[PDB]
Amino acid sequence: HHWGYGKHNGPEHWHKDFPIAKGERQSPVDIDTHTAKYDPSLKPLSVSYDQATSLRILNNGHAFNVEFDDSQDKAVLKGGPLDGTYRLIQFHFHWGSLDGQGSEHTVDKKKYAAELHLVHWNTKYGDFGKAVQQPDGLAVLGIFLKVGSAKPGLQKVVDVLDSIKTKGKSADFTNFDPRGLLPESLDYWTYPGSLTTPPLLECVTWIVLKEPISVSSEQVLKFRKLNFNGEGEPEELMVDNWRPAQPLKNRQIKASFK
Ligand SMILES: O=C1NC(=O)[C@@H](c2ccccc2)S1
Ligand SMILES: [Zn+2]
Numbered sequence: 001h002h003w004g005y006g007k008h009n010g011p012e013h014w015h016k017d018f019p020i021a022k023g024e025r026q027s028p029v030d031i032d033t034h035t036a037k038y039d040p041s042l043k044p045l046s047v048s049y050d051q052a053t054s055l056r057i058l059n060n061g062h063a064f065n066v067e068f069d070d071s072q073d074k075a076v077l078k079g080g081p082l083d084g085t086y087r088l089i090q091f092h093f094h095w096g097s098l099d100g101q102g103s104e105h106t107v108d109k110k111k112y113a114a115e116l117h118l119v120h121w122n123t124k125y126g127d128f129g130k131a132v133q134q135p136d137g138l139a140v141l142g143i144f145l146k147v148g149s150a151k152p153g154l155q156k157v158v159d160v161l162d163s164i165k166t167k168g169k170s171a172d173f174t175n176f177d178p179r180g181l182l183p184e185s186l187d188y189w190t191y192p193g194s195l196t197t198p199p200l201l202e203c204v205t206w207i208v209l210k211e212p213i214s215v216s217s218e219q220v221l222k223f224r225k226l227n228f229n230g231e232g233e234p235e236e237l238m239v240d241n242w243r244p245a246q247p248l249k250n251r252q253i254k255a256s257f258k
Contacts, residue, residue, distance in 0.1 A: 001017055001198060003017065003018075003197075003198045004061075004062065004228060005062075005228075005240055005241050005242075006236075011243045011244060014198055014200065017198065018198045018199055018200045020194070020199075020200050020201065020202060021200050023194070023200075023202055024202075024249050024250065025192050025193055025194055025202045025249070025251065026193065026194045026200065026202070026246035026247070027104070027105075027193030027194040027195070027196050027204060027206060027243075027246060028103075028104035028105040028106070028193070028196055028243060028244075028245055028246065029105065029191065029193065029245050029246055029247075029248050029251075029253070030105070030106045030107075030108075030109055030245040030248075031105060031106065031107050031108070031189050031208065031253055032108060032253070033107060033108050034108075035253070036189055036252075036253040036254065036255045037252065037254060037255060038254075038255045038256075038257065038258050039254040039255065039256070042080055042081055042190070042254065042256045043079045043080060043081075044079050044080070045077075045078075045079045045080035045186050045188065045207065045256070046076075046077070046078040046079040046080075047077055047141070047179075047182065047186065048075065048076045048077070048078065049075045049088070049177070049178050049179050050075075051074040051075060052068060052074055052075035052088060052176075052177065052178055052179075053068055053069040053074050053075070053174075054066055054067070054068055054173050054174055054175060054176035054177075054178070055067050055068060055069055055172075055173065055174065056170050056171065056172060056173050057157070057160055057164060057170060057171050057173040058164070058169075058170040059164040059165070059166060059167055059168065059169050059170070059226060059227075059238075060167065060168075061167035061168070061228055061229075061230075062197060062228075062241060063092040063093060063094065063238075063241055064092060064093075064161070064164060064226065065090045065091070065092045066090060066091050066092070066157065066173055066176060066178070067089070067090045067173075068088050068089060068090060070087045070088060070089045070121070070128075073085060073087060073123065074087075074088075075087070075088035075178070076088065076120070077118075077120045077139050077141060077207075080188065080190065080207055080256065081190045081205055081207065081254070082139055082205060082207075083136075084122055084123065084124055085122070085123045085124075086120035086121060086122050086123065086138070086139040087120055087121055087123050088118060088119070088120050088178070089119050089120065089121055089128055090119050091116060091117060091118045091119065091178060091181070092116075092117055092119075093114050093115065093116050093117070093145070093223065094114060094115050094117070094196075094241050094242040094243075095113065095114035095115075095145075095220060095223050095224070095239065095240075095241065095242070096111075096113060096114065096239060096240050096242065097224065097237075097239040097240050099113045099147045099217070099220070100113070101113075101240065101242070102114040102115065102145075102220075102240070102242055103115040103144055103145075103242060104142075104196050104242045104243055104244075104245075105142055105144075105206075105208050105245070106245050107144070112144040112145055112146055112212060113145050113146055113147050113215070113220055114144075114145035114215070114220060114223065115142055115143065115144055115145065115242070116142070116143040116144075116145060116181060116213075117140050117141070117142055117196075118140065118141040118142075118143070118178065118181075119138060119140055120138060120139045120140070120141070121137060121138050121139075122134070122136055122137050122138065122139070125137055131203065132195070132199075132201050132203045133201070133203065134203055135192070135202065135203060136203075136205060137203040137204075138195075138203050138204045138205070139204070139205045139206075139207060140204050140205075140206055140207065141207050141209070142206060142207065142208040142209065143181065143182065143183065143208075143209045143212070143213055144208075144209070144212035144213070145212060145213055145214075145215050145220070146212045146213070146214055146215070147214070147215060147216070147217050147220060148214040148215075148216070149214045149216060150214075150215065150216035150218070150219060151180075151181070151213055151214060151215045151216070151219065152180065153177065153179070153180020153181055154180070154181065154215055154219055155219070156176055157176070158219050158222045158223070160173060161222055161223070161225065161226055162225075164226075165225070165226060165227050165231075166227045166229060166230050166231040166233075167227065167228065167229060167230040167231075168230055168231075169231070181213065182209075182213075183209055183211035183212065183213050184211060185209070185210065185211040186209065186256075187209070187210040187211065187255075187256055187257040188207050188208060188209050188210060188255075188256045188257075189206075189207075189208045189210065189253050189254065189255055189256070190205065190206060190207050190208070190253070190254050190256070191206050191251055191252065191253040191254065192204070192205060192206070192251060193205075193206045193251075196242075196243045197243070210257065223238070223239075224237060224238070224239050225237070226238035228241075
């Protein structure tokens with residue numbers, strides 16, 4: 001597969017190799033804040049990242065992933081809409097060429113400068129590969145980024161990006177604390193959806209925080225210096241690696257808050 005974000009291989013093309021692209025529970029979606037309903041039954045959300053073990057950061061040609069040790073329950077997401085225990089495997093971002101675009105989800109059609117995805121898999125399936133074949137296999141915690149003040153807990157990530165400029169480059173990335181990426185509030189929206197990149201599998205419980213985090217223009221400018229290409233190839237800046245909103249179809253977006 002040669003999918004990506006260009007005119008020729010971007011989201012509009014994905015359906016030809018991955019027909020579920022046109023499925024019934026695709027992500028991202030627009031979150032209409034006036035249609036989403038408070039659900040008083042949602043249990044409280046539990047983000048337990050005290051024992052998180054980061055390992056490595058990888059430019060995969062599409063984004064950069066901060067990978068964790070997910071061989072035990074070290075950093076887990078529980079509660080909210082979720083039954084059972086979901087293990088953090090990695091986080092990454094999607095971002096734009098300009099501060100007015102970059103997020104995958106939108107809020108009343110507003111696009112943020114970027115969106116953070118903390119990916120977790122349901123430990124009842126044993127491994128990530130099995131979990132992505134299940135409707136309840138993953139939980140993604142999505143956090144919007146707006147441009148304003150710097151986010152101090154992001155700066156270790158932006159500082160290593162020079163070392164992973166091109167596709168296939170990785171760097172050791174131990175002792176990174178992903179708590180430093182969260183906003184104050186854990187108020188959220190939730191809905192059933194999909195992976196936002198091929199293979200586009202309909203395996204995700206989406207949990208999208210209401211409160212964006214602020215990052216500085218300088219921080220996001222450094223995301224934009226990354227490259228989709230490999231070393232020694234013609235430079236194609238890694239920007240606008242987001243999929244646009246997809247049809248909601250027969251789904252409800254629930255709010256955790258009034
Ligand atoms: O949150 C998401 N963003 C992505 O790129 C999708 C994905 C695809 C493959 C592995 C992990 C995550 S799901
Ligand atoms: Zn993502």
